[PDB]
Symmetry: D2
Subunit: 262 residues, 4 copies
């Protein structure tokens, strides 16, 4: 729809899905802020974005979402620059490959703080902004692991389940403040990580399309292919925008049919 009056903040929004989300936000004419830990990847995205949207209101800034303090400073900077945020998107981050046996206490704590505080901090910092905005909405990006765990990503599965449960609570708590809260459940989505996997394939005669196709078949994905970041982004936009004004405390499945549960 038309988000020319929206101010949308995307935290962790330089990765595949986060980037795609910023692009669609700009397409809709929103003022957009985003932050990332890697200063390099952030500016490499800011560059390409300004190329495509010369007349965009954009504010990019390095930030560690785990550092409450920095998030406070970023949120303040966002307000001064673009005005009170009406939309907040928190990116999923990447999964951690480990069975229970392979996961130390150190890995557990890191994975937990990563998935939880990446949501808790931005939310807490921007909430006083969302509250004063109309059509306010938060979206916490998540994966199907939250409701359908996989054997090689035990810690991540469990953290993501927590965040999923948190989304429901925030939805209920923030309703009186006029803020909707939803998330999405991605399946397997194209990424640099998968491209590095493809690069190290044993079947060299297969191209990216055939390889990912075979991978999706081994992963028993009904749609028979990996998702595209822009497809995740499209569900996020739906949730972030007034298009879903009667939707809060829910999730949208973006896994290509992976969820066995009905």
């Amino acid at each position: 729809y038309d988000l020319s009056e929206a101010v949308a903040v995307v935290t962790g929004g330089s990765s595949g899905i986060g980037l795609a989300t910023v692009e669609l936000l700009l397409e809709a004419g929103a003022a957009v802020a985003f932050c990332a830990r890697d200063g390099e990847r952030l500016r490499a995205a800011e560059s390409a974005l300004r190329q495509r949207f010369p007349g965009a209101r954009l504010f990019a800034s390095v930030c560690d979402v785990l550092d409450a303090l920095q998030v406070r400073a970023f949120a303040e900077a966002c307000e001064r620059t673009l005005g009170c945020a009406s939309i907040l998107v928190n990116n999923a981050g990447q999964g951690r490959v480990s069975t229970f046996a392979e996961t130390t206490d150190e890995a557990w704590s890191e994975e937990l703080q990563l998935k939880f505080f990446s949501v808790i901090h931005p939310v807490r910092a921007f909430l006083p902004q969302l509250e004063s905005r109309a059509d306010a909405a938060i979206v916490c990006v998540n994966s199907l692991l939250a409701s359908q765990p996989e054997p090689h990503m035990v810690a991540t599965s469990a953290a993501r389940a927590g965040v999923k449960n948190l989304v429901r609570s925030m939805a209920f708590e923030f309703a009186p403040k006029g803020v909707r809260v939803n998330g999405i459940l991605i399946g397997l989505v194209e990424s640099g990580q998968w491209r590095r996997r493809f690069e190290a394939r044993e079947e060299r005669e297969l191209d990216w399309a055939q390889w990912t196709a075979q991978l999706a078949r081994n992963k028993q994905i009904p749609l028979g292919r990996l998702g595209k970041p822009i497809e995740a982004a499209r569900a996020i936009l739906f949730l972030a925008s007034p298009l879903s004004a009667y939707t809060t405390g829910s999730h949208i499945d973006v896994s290509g049919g992976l969820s066995r549960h009905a």
Copy 2:
């Protein structure tokens, strides 16, 4: 989105949510067909639509969705008038107020056949068209009772849960045919049955807006209001279009926060 090359079919699409959906489809430039039992209401909706959309490719026909033979004939008429269908939407129909103690065998059978065959007939009949079209998608409108039952709608809840489960199965079976299958779960949405409850109110000073707001409060809806047909229609539009190309066998919550489950 750009649905100009789509042919969309809406069964039971003459009332609130049905009509709103047809409108959004026409807005997206889709060719649209719809059917219902009440010819007068159907022709009345058709008229209004042709007013707003002079150059619309539109086909409206009376049809009883429980009658397999009428559904077959309707899908044939759509085919010869607008082309092969690429989008199919099956409306929710209305719920039945009855506890277990109140519901007879015949009421059970009526409710089950209503909810089930309203889906099975149009799907079984349009599938050959959907299967030959690109971006083919089916959306079965359902209610939150399918996963979170209510005491005074026992038969309806159970029936709706069946359909929800059917949606997953259809999604898995039709995926190899290039057809996506999803649904939505409406909460309380403004309807004629609510408008008649309104006209029976004791508090005459309350208007439609004040009344429905008070009802939503007593129903403990976080968003503090009933949904609008167009909000449901937008979620259907999302699921029906290429915007949700990686989403199948899922549902979207349109209940305004009523789902307690996380």
Copy 3:
């Protein structure tokens, strides 16, 4: 537990899971009634039971659970022979192998009436007895298809999902009557239909145990084997007795780890 003061009814309780349940009830000293369509199998089960349990208060009767009138008469016979019922168990029945594309309207209607009325009739008929008894509990045996459908059992899955949903409703409505209502969700359990699949095997050297083990592997059951009737019966016994006095409107998983949902 001590069910010596209980009167338990088991509908469709002449086959594997049914019989095993009746046995466990007799073990707990309960008075027990059971009915089924196959009189020969019923009388055969009755005989064996009276062998093992000389002083048992037992009543077996042929009855078609789809026939409301026969169910009413059976509940009357139980009443006058053993006393008012305090426990009611409704067996799962067998599933139907068919995809959507294979299932006709009539097959749909048959499957829906089978799954639904096998529950509705005994419940509607025994409720007046259950309502007047202490520790009254109803258990509806169901399968994991109710929440996690399978491609070759579409109609059965949808039907079972309906019943699962009905169990929640009945639980809420009967609670003010002092009646608990739960169910179980069986995975693959050893049965006559598996024993006939076994006799059709190509690998003749495999015995029943080796074969079912290989089947469980191919079905990806974590526990690596089919369940046994008695395992299902124990969960039913748990839910049917005072041991689960604070549990109603729920289900117990008896699938050997097949449920992917968390």
Copy 4:
């Protein structure tokens, strides 16, 4: 059943539910170990237990389940004393009263580590024991908040959702080691905490039975009363014992009908 050959360890097992669980374990004739942080409450339980079961094999020991090191030492002590554990139960602990707004980063981290490591440590330490035992089973005590969050216990709800998701993963991972893993979902259960609440009531004319009754009504609990620790304990015993040999990666509802989801 008969657990006279079982060695069962209960961590955090001195509180209401944990204590009740040890008693039933001893009733079944199991050798039992348990640990708690409070040395006082642990010995106050050890005392009463030895009074009731003079011929019991019991080993009680102060331990902080958050301290990996102590848990290692306790597990070792258990083996030397009673032999390899065949059963492991991890108690739920108490919920934390806070909305999202009322929860600091410090409270979040504490609540998370508390709920996660109270499971991760005992499991990791005893797994090499469970693996060598037949009929091995773990039970992680949990609350309905894990799947149905409450507004005044946001952090706890989310942590419990994580643990619930973890139970499913452990179930799958440990299946090849012959170890089942399940949990329970308690509703509101009688406790000292509730007794202190009753003590501070405004309606002094109400006794414990009337007060808890009214509280259950305000909490909309179908069964119209609080649960009893022994009732939670009974579901735990079912899961811990061979009675549930075909059940893994699942949960049993012990909430008196609180779960709205079907």
